[PDB]
Amino acid sequence: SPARTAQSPLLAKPVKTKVVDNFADMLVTPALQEALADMGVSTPSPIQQTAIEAVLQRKNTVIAAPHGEGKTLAYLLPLYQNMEKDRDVYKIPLRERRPRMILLAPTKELVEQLQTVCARLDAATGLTSVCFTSRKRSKYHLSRMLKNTMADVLVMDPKLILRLLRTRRLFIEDLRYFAVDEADAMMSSLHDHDAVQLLMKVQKRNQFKYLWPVQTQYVFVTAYMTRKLEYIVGRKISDPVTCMFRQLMHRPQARLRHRFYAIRREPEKFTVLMHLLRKNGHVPLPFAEGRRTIIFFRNIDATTAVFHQLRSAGFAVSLLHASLPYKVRKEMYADFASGRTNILCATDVAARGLDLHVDMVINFDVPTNALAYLSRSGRTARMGREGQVLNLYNKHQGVIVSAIKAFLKDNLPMEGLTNRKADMMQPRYAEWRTHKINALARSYVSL
Amino acid sequence: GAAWYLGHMQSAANMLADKVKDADFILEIRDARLPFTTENPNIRKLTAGKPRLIIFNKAELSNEDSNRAIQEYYERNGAFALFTSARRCWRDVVEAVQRFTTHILPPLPYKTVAHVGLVVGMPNVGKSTLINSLRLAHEYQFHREDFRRSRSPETVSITPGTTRGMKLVPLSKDPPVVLYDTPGLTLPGCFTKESGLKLAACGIIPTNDVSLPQGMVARYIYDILVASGSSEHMAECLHLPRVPISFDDCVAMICERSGTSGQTEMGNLDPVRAHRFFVHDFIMGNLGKITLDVLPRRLL
Amino acid sequence: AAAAAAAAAAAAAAAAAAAAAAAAAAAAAAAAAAAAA
Amino acid sequence: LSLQAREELSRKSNELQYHVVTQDWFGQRVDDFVTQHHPEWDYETVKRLVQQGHIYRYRKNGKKRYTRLTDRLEFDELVVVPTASFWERQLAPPSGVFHLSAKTREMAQEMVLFKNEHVIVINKPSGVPIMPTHDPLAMNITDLLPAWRYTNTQTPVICHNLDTETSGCVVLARSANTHRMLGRMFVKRVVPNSVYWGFAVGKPPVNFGRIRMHFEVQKGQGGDVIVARPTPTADSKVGIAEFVVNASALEFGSFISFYPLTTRRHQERIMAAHALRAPLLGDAKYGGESAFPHSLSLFWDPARKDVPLHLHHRKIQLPYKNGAGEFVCVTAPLPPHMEKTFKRLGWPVDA
RNA sequence: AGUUUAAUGUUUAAAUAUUUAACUAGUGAUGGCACAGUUGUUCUAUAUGUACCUAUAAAAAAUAGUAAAAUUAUUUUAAUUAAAUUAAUAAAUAAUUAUUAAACUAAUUUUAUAUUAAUAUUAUGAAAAAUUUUUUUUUUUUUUAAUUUUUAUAUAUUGAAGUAAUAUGGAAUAUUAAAAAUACAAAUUUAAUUUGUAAUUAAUAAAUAUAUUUUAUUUUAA
RNA sequence: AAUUAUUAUUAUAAAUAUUAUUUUAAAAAUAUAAAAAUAAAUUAUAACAAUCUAAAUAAAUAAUAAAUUAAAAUAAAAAUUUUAAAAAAAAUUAAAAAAUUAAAAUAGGGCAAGUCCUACUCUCCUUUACAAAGAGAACGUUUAUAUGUAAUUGUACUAUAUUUAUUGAAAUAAUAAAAGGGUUGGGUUUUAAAAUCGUUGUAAAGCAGAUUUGUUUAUAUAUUUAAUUU
RNA sequence: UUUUUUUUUUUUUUUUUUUUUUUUUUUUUUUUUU
RNA sequence: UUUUU
Ligand SMILES: Nc1ncnc2c1ncn2[C@@H]1O[C@H](COP(=O)(O)OP(=O)(O)OP(=O)(O)O)[C@@H](O)[C@H]1O
Structure with a gap:
């Protein structure tokens, strides 16, 4: 809001809205445009235009977009552009265990995609990237630190980076770039508070003045602007160049269309799902017939209950939650992705920023939040693709769906500083507010 | 400003058709003393093929000669006709709707749905009292709409106004011959000079006012009965020299229960207390048991 | 409501009642084109 | 509106994007930019689009700056100003995208009670229609209209359609710009703005009050009634009038004055009936149908259709004022058919 | 002359009075006796139980934890005035004002500067768009003291046959351009039209048009 | 009945006792009460008459921040305005009117939730219970057991899930509290005993030999007709 | 750890219908607007 | 499923 975010750090300070509208005029090297157009990107999206040269310069940035607006290229592309101008122009030596840039990522299925989208940038020649997740005898899989790594870009979950540090195997000594992805949740107790405690050790090294002055470029990319994200950035980071686009943000996309089903009975939530799963979809490689679809559940106790109920009813349903083993979860993902199995009984793992082909999200329980709803819904329609989200709301989630139903027909920001998830925000509406129970009555009935 | 539907009926036709396009058996409540003034204009071309159950009420005061032809007329067309004295109340008219379908109904495809009945007619000749007698008792003894009979708001107890949409009365249960309402389409108030006479003659539209004084219908019931006899026997019933020469004497001869402030030597009686008498008594079928309409022997 | 166009009264019979509402940057500070008595 | 801004976002049209070059046009007022690039629209046709929102926006940065006509352009942002080219579609683009012999050009000049540079008020003959x-x-007013074009104004526009049988006073606007203004004067008043006179036969209830009926026009000519004290809320609009029985024939007629707060069809006569x-x-x-004329000592020969409806649009308070501060009130004098029954009853016909 | 209502009365003769207004015909009843408050009567009005049904009487504390309201003492001796905001594994301080205390150095006039700790104190409430006038709330008495000028105008002539020219206060010039005015001739479709010349128009180029101090804040002396 | 107060406290007995408290010499409103007209007793009548002074004596009541005012005009403040400012010229006294001043952020429609309401299939602590065990159960009691809603209640390998299944419903027509005046719109308005008690105006201060040099004008219509005269 | 094997989540060697609004036309017409 | 504006 304009008449707000003045009484809030990280803002009241100008938001770089200087559109540059094409890749040439953002000065991205033709060795990177050839690789971009190779991917299929010709025109810069709204977030890209304005924040790619706000990080092509060394300005510490807060990229904030809606959903599927191109943020992953937004921050990553210019950082490869920047790394290339380090190793070649400055000739800053690689060294062994000292990575030029780290990337963070909340979920294991999000880490990996951030690697292949960065792997496709070997046009940024020398840059070699390695991602790492949990495994079996995985502590014996930093062998790829002893081994060839020298990896200028090291994308990993924050917790495993932190252990590589405190046990003296990583050495942020030469950390030139420090990026964070899906920071809305990563910089909070929701994940581990481990994004912080990692800024600082980096923040306390570029102000050490007894090793070379490596001013680490901090880059935060977050679809949601939470109250937590403001202060740990507005109050600690130096000159955060914001890129908020307040007239398209905290809103679900336009071409995405919503459907609200009112369900009175606990066990009736099922037929409404199979009746929804009668859209008969099947693709090459991405007794009953469902389309491309994800089903989001309140809990992994239930995400497998319905999963088996679907499967034993004849669908090719898939299953993805955290308590799965390593082989099954790896497989059960590589079936849904790549054509097979067409429907994915998922929990909130799939809500957190994943890209694929999905085209229909069933909220098997409309979530009690505005993040847990924009994150699920925002997986449906990405970069202009059409898409439908169906909401099986209940009696207990009626209020949130009394308002979601009302904010959509108006296209309003969902309480534009989202809450209830990262900033749990007992202040329903963000200010020194505890809304009144108004009156001017002054009759005060007698007996 | 509580008036009724106001407009020529011949523009309420193409909407009446689509009301018959879904109905099965057409009903009507008429007055046997007015076989074709209490009819909707389309009775001729209204349906011609839906099984009509056309009822003439108050038949005991309508003449019996004209009763035969009007009976066999529709009875030749196939559409039925039933005459009732109304003393034996509509309870027997209801029995008709229990019988006058079992013989003519097409068998229902689904064992218990309805026989959607389209009713028409003037609300003041017997159509209202036929609905609101079966509409009130359905609230207590219950067949459909399936709720606990508590949501009827304050001060209605009946709703023939402002909703009258899908509102319908379930007259019967196992052959559930339900009946519609037909928001009143009759007596348009744009009636004819003469039709208002025959209407207010029968007790229908009993309003006798500046629009229609007694002396205008009384002049009509007297000049209609130019044949003095069995009507002069109502005159002779009150000391009248049998034949009345004209309107002056007969109305003034019957001033025994009439009068106003008149002298002890020259009494100036009141001819309006004699007006209403001669008017309202013919309403009761007391004077003569004779119809008003002409009964076209031709098809029209 | 929105109190616009104040009026600073100087005396009377020497202010002309059109110069009261003058000292406001507008089409006033001119001569009333058609006065009424 | 939120859907109006949607199709605006999802329409290629031709979207004539208009750069704002460094030299000639950066700095100029927008209504100069549109009017010297798009000569097709009249200037008023250009103000409507520029203010209405079916506007020629300007786009510099990531949002659309809808603007007032005087907002000036920016220092070569190549700040495009998008203008609409194929409005026709779901948009529904805005407004602007015989002979009259004498004995008529004279007949239409004895029917003029008031004229200035902004309106013309006439005196309609009871029985001549408008549409x-x-x-x-049929000889109606709209065919006559090129007769009150006194001083060569552009064909006055009729403002409130008096009915056929209604006599009285009409208002034309002499200017399509004045006609927009004279709308708020007619629809759904709160306090009266006009007087209808009439001779209802039969002394009504109390000689002061207000009538609230809820009309419903079923085609053809259904014309329904009070059915809902609140409203049927779907097909019904209410018509309110504050009637005053000025004087009354002792018990058989009255001379009633209706101040029709609303604008409903025959609301004068259906509420009077x-x-x-x-x-x-x-x-x-x-x-x-009470009788032909309701059976009086009036002219009573054909009657069946002789007596014309004694209803007269008597006075209209125009918003144009007069040399003295008073607002102007046309006072269309009664036709002889009401001057017949007024003097036949000896009442002082107030012109 | 016993029975469900209307005016006056308005601290009234009454802490419900006089007249107005709606039906029943004592062989079945004025109190005998009887009932009582987390409940009697109950002709079922959540009406009535001794002039406020929160029944009355007695004893008591949680009962403004509540924009509640009050809170007793002149002549004094230190300052600020809207600032703060992260629910939740290893990241230097909430902020305010307040009470009480603490320390001058790489760091310039030979200038200037309220920093720190401990404790006390967390409710003074914006929704849209647009965007990357001013310093005053508070004075020990005598003087002293620098922010003051009102209004802007324009007519006549002649010829037109319904338009210009001349005079005045922007003026006349000069050329390039056009004269849609226009006037004249000549050619003609008579006349109208064709044609040119000049009034005139516009652009552009050049030379022109009037005067202080003095009434409110910059200090003393006791 | 607070009284020496609106009063025959009447269960009974009764029928020619003059059987012992009511000021004032004026006028209006009001209050009671009153000849005539559009076969009855009625009207309405806000129409004559009739009763209700003053002064003298006696004396209460509510109310009270004070003014230095207060006539009259006229602009200026989130404001609603108590004041202040310019400009005026506003005299005492008694009486009578109530125009203004001293008694609630309301009335009406249109929406949505809530309490009230009914209803149980699933909710919680009911007690009163019933059966069961126990005594060779003529009965008295103490444990173990699910019944009715009885009836009160409440129910919108480091990661990436979890803190809510746990009573369910009804234009529940009226209340309450909110908002509001392509989905969508009907409502328009402001009070019920007033000692006036501040200004106000109206009348007045009782005989003036005498209108009106100049103040100030509730003063108020200019035409609807009829019948003539050219 | 410990560094070896040729890989392995590799082991490993301590809008309306349906089977645009409104302005008081009398079907079809007007006129304003979006 | 499809007619209409
Ligand atoms: N400049 C571009 N032009 C066209 N398509 C693009 C462009 N950049 C990215 N895309 C495509 O659009 C998809 C959606 O954008 P992306 O994957 O970056 O979403 P995201 O930034 O992760 O989403 P979110 O904003 O919700 O976090 C990309 O995965 C890619 O397929």
Whole structure:
């Protein structure tokens, strides 16, 4: 809001809205445009235009977009552009265990995609990237630190980076770039508070003045602007160049269309799902017939209950939650992705920023939040693709769906500083507010 | 400003058709003393093929000669006709709707749905009292709409106004011959000079006012009965020299229960207390048991 | 409501009642084109 | 509106994007930019689009700056100003995208009670319609209209369609710009703005009050009634008038004055035919069947259609004022057919 | 002359009075006796139980934890005035004002500067768009003291046959351009039209048009 | 009945006792009460008459921040305005009117939730219970057991899930509290005993030999007709 | 750890219908607007 | 499923 975010750090300070509208005029090297157009990107999206040269310069940035607006290229592309101008122009030596840039990522299925989208940038020649997740005898899989790594870009979950540090195997000594992805949740107790405690050790090294002055470029990319994200950035980071686009943000996309089903009975939530799963979809490689679809559940106790109920009813349903083993979860993902199995009984793992082909999200329980709803819904329609989200709301989630139903027909920001998830925000509406129970009555009935 | 539907009926036709396009058996409540003034204009071309159950009420005061032809007329067309004295109340008219379908109904495809009945007619000749007698008792003894009979708001107890949409009365249960309402389409108030006479003659539209004084219908019931006899026997019933020469004497001869402030030597009686008498008594079928309409022997 | 166009009264019979509402940057500070008595 | 801004976002059209070059046009007022690039629209046709929102926006940065006509351009942002090219579609683009012999050009000049540079008020003859019903044939006001173009104004526009049988006072606007202004004067008043006179036969209830009926026009000519004290809320609009029985024939007629706060059809006569069931004299459409003229010592020969409806649009308070501070009130004098029954009753016909 | 209502009365003769207004015909009843408050009567009005049904009487504390309201003492001796905001594994301080205390150095006039700790104190409430006038709330008495000028105008002539020219206060010039005015001739479709010349128009180029101090804040002396 | 107060406290007995408290010499409103007209007793009548002074004596009541005012005009403040400012010229006294001043952020429609309401299939602590065990159960009691809603209640390998299944419903027509005046719109308005008690105006201060040099004008219509005269 | 094997989540060697609004036309017409 | 504006 304009008449707000003045009484809030990280803002009241100008938001770089200087559109540059094409890749040439953002000065991205033709060795990177050839690789971009190779991917299929010709025109810069709204977030890209304005924040790619706000990080092509060394300005510490807060990229904030809606959903599927191109943020992953937004921050990553210019950082490869920047790394290339380090190793070649400055000739800053690689060294062994000292990575030029780290990337963070909340979920294991999000880490990996951030690697292949960065792997496709070997046009940024020398840059070699390695991602790492949990495994079996995985502590014996930093062998790829002893081994060839020298990896200028090291994308990993924050917790495993932190252990590589405190046990003296990583050495942020030469950390030139420090990026964070899906920071809305990563910089909070929701994940581990481990994004912080990692800024600082980096923040306390570029102000050490007894090793070379490596001013680490901090880059935060977050679809949601939470109250937590403001202060740990507005109050600690130096000159955060914001890129908020307040007239398209905290809103679900336009071409995405919503459907609200009112369900009175606990066990009736099922037929409404199979009746929804009668859209008969099947693709090459991405007794009953469902389309491309994800089903989001309140809990992994239930995400497998319905999963088996679907499967034993004849669908090719898939299953993805955290308590799965390593082989099954790896497989059960590589079936849904790549054509097979067409429907994915998922929990909130799939809500957190994943890209694929999905085209229909069933909220098997409309979530009690505005993040847990924009994150699920925002997986449906990405970069202009059409898409439908169906909401099986209940009696207990009626209020949130009394308002979601009302904010959509108006296209309003969902309480534009989202809450209830990262900033749990007992202040329903963000200010020194505890809304009144108004009156001017002054009759005060007698007996 | 509580008036009724106001407009020529011949523009309420193409909407009446689509009301018959879904109905099965057409009903009507008429007055046997007015076989074709209490009819909707389309009775001729209204349906011609839906099984009509056309009822003439108050038949005991309508003449019996004209009763035969009007009976066999529709009875030749196939559409039925039933005459009732109304003393034996509509309870027997209801029995008709229990019988006058079992013989003519097409068998229902689904064992218990309805026989959607389209009713028409003037609300003041017997159509209202036929609905609101079966509409009130359905609230207590219950067949459909399936709720606990508590949501009827304050001060209605009946709703023939402002909703009258899908509102319908379930007259019967196992052959559930339900009946519609037909928001009143009759007596348009744009009636004819003469039709208002025959209407207010029968007790229908009993309003006798500046629009229609007694002396205008009384002049009509007297000049209609130019044949003095069995009507002069109502005159002779009150000391009248049998034949009345004209309107002056007969109305003034019957001033025994009439009068106003008149002298002890020259009494100036009141001819309006004699007006209403001669008017309202013919309403009761007391004077003569004779119809008003002409009964076209031709098809029209 | 929105109190616009104040009026600073100087005396009377020497202010002309059109110069009261003058000292406001507008089409006033001119001569009333058609006065009424 | 939120859907109006949607199709605006999802329409290629031709979207004539208009750069704002460094030299000539950066700095100029937008209404100069549109009017010297798009000569097709009249300037008023350009203000409507520029203010309405079916506007020629300007786009510099990531949002659309809808603007007022005086906002000036920016220092070569190549700040495109997008203008609409194929409005026709779901948009529904805005407004602007015989002979009259003498004895008529004179007849239409004795029917003028008031004229200035902004309106013309006439005195309509009871029985001449306004809109044509026999599409080639009937002599109505709209065919007469090129006769009150006094001083060569552009064909005055009719403002409130008086009915056929209604006599009285009409208002034309002499200017399509004045006609927009004279709308707020007619629809759904709160306090009266006009006086209808009439001679209803039959002294109604109390000689002061207000009538609230809820009309419903079922085609053809259903014309329904109070059915809902609140409203049927779907097909019904209410018509409110504050009637005053000025003087009254002792018990058989009255001279009633209606101040029609609303704008409903025959609301004068249908509310008069059910203020008592005493309709207006000669109102064969809604009342009119009591007798032919309701059977009086008036001209009583054909009657069946002789007596014209004694209803007269008497006075209209225009918003244009006068040399003295008073607002102007036309006072269309009664036709002889009401001057007949007024003097036949000896009342002082107030012109 | 016993029975469900209307005016006056308005601290009234009454802490419900006089007249107005709606039906029943004592062989079945004025109190005998009887009932009582987390409940009697109950002709079922959540009406009535001794002039406020929160029944009355007695004893008591949680009962403004509540924009509640009050809170007793002149002549004094230190300052600020809207600032703060992260629910939740290893990241230097909430902020305010307040009470009480603490320390001058790489760091310039030979200038200037309220920093720190401990404790006390967390409710003074914006929704849209647009965007990357001013310093005053508070004075020990005598003087002293620098922010003051009102209004802007324009007519006549002649010829037109319904338009210009001349005079005045922007003026006349000069050329390039056009004269849609226009006037004249000549050619003609008579006349109208064709044609040119000049009034005139516009652009552009050049030379022109009037005067202080003095009434409110910059200090003393006791 | 607070009284020496609106009063025959009447269960009974009764029928020619003059059987012992009511000021004032004026006028209006009001209050009671009153000849005539559009076969009855009625009207309305806000129409004559009739009763209700003053002064003298006696004396209460509510109310009270004070003014230095207060006539009259006229602009200026989130404001609603108590004041202040310019400009005026506003005299005492008694009486009578109530125009203004001293008694609630309301009335009406249109929406949505809530309490009230009914209803149970699933909710919680009911107690009163019933059966069961126990005594060779003529009965008295103490444990173990699910019944009715009885009836009160409440129910919108480091990661990436979890803190809510746990009573369910009804234009529940009226209340309450909110908002509001392509989905969508009907409502328009402001009070019920007033000692006036501040200004106000109206009348007045009782005989003036005498209108009106100049103040100030509730003063108020200019035409609807009829019948003539050219 | 410990560094070896040729890989392995590799082991490993301590809008309306349906089977645009409104302005008080009398079907078809007007006029304003979006 | 499809007619209409
Ligand atoms: N400049 C571009 N032009 C066209 N398509 C693009 C462009 N950049 C990215 N895309 C495509 O659009 C998809 C959606 O954008 P992306 O994957 O970056 O979403 P995201 O930034 O992760 O989403 P979110 O904003 O919700 O976090 C990309 O995965 C890619 O397929």
